[PDB]
Structure formats: C-alpha cells, structure tokens
From a paper:
The replication of the two chromosomes in the pathogenic bacterium Vibrio cholerae is coordinated by the binding of initiator protein RctB to a checkpoint sequence, crtS. V. cholerae Chr2 originates from an iteron-type plasmid, evident from its replication origin (ori2) and initiator (RctB). RctB is divided into four structural regions (I–IV)14. Domains, I, II and III, interact with DNA via Helix-Turn-Helix (HTH) motifs and are essential for ori2 replication.
Numbering used by the authors:
A (entry chain A): 530 to 614, 618 to 658
B (entry chain B): 530 to 615, 618 to 657
Write the structure that this text describes.
C-alpha cells in the first residue's frame, strides 16, 4: 500500500515522506533511507532493510540493449546539465527508461542537442 | 537541499527523500519529518527544525468565506472518503481544495454530497 513498483524505481510512501530507490542506490544511501523510514513508521530497521532489499532486487538497470548503463555515465550527465541551470537522478532514470535513442547516444558518449533537449524535457516535468 | 514552495504545501528534496509539509502538519508528524531529513543529510535536527519552521511559516491555510478550514474538518472528510474508496492523501486533498471554492464552502457547511464526492474522486484519480 505504501509501495509503488516500477521497472527501474520503487517509491515507499509513509505519511510526509516518500523514499525512492533504484539499482543505483549505494549501500550507505540505503542505510540512511532505512533510518528515515524507521523515524516515520516506528518499524524495526531490520524489517525495513529486508523489504527494501527484496524491492530493489526486483528492479532493473538502465540498458542500451542488454549492455547496462553505469552510475558514472548517469552522474557525469546530471553534473553536466545542472552546472548550466534542476534535474534529479530519479527523473533522469524515469526519463531515459522511455527514450531508447537517448540511452544509446548517452552510452556512446554523444551528448548532443537531442540529449540536451531530453534533459530539459525531464527537468520541466514531475 | 532543493525546496519547492507552493501556497499550501512545501516539498523538501534530499537525495532519496522528499518530505511534504503544510500548516496542518502536527507537532508529532513534524518531529518525525525532521528526524527523517537529519538521517538523510547528516545535518543537526535543531538546525533542520529551524528551516522547516521557516518554510511552514510561509504557507497558508485553506480558506472559504472569510474563515479558515481546520484540521478536524479535513481529517473527518479524509476518513469518510477512504473508508469507502479502500485512497486519498491529505497532500492531494489540500492541493485539490486549494482550487475548488464551491467544494471548500460545501465541506465547511457540512454538506458532503455528490459534488464533494465527485471532487474527491477527481483528486484520488489525479
């Protein structure tokens, strides 16, 4: 009920808070997310870890075919865009999951007008 | 880190977390929200508390006919709807009523009729 499952992202809703996890979430960022949910819910950190771990295990990486797009690719692009403007990793993940031609261009290192236009589109939406 | 101010709601974005606060957030829910932001950011709770308090101070109540719509009105309506469509969050009912003067008046007068139920269906689909 508190959980919305997508292919690349999972969102966990607990009153005032929303936590969004992916396959790109680091173990440290996951420890903090688990403590942030435990302060809202009063649930044991052990039980929330187990659940969070099952949910990310059902998520997939971004892919140009079966070739996985890696975190430095995603972060170096986010830095490039934001030092010129805001775009969150959650919206870049969700935006690239529906833009095949853009995932290939990004994977090959061709950050052109087509890519810049996709990022403007992502930032202008939810 | 990133803050989105609206007339009745504020959203605070810190990596994996988004916290949404209003003038209707209780002291206890505001306590949990501050501790959840401190676990993400590593900032001092007393310092996060001052920031949230500054932002909640910039937000306004829902209003109709020279009056303020109070929390028991909003919560008793949320219970009424959700014990039937079992979902609408306080954040979406706030955002929905902020643009619906006739519905704010109907709710304030205790006339929860088809017009109200239709507005709530719209917010929950939305």
């Amino acid at each position: 009920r508190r959980v919305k499952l997508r292919k690349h992202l999972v969102e966990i809703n607990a009153d005032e808070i929303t936590i969004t996890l992916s396959r790109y979430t680091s173990p440290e960022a996951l420890e903090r997310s688990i403590t942030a949910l435990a302060a809202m819910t009063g649930h044991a950190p052990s039980s929330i870890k187990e659940e969070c771990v099952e949910l990310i295990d059902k998520l997939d990486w971004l892919r140009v075919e079966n070739d996985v797009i890696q975190y430095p690719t995603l972060s170096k692009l986010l830095e490039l865009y934001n030092s010129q403007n805001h775009l969150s990793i959650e919206k870049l993940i969700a935006g690239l999951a529906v833009r095949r031609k853009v995932c290939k261009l990004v994977q090959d290192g061709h950050i052109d007008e087509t890519v810049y236009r996709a990022l403007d589109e992502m930032a202008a939406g939810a």
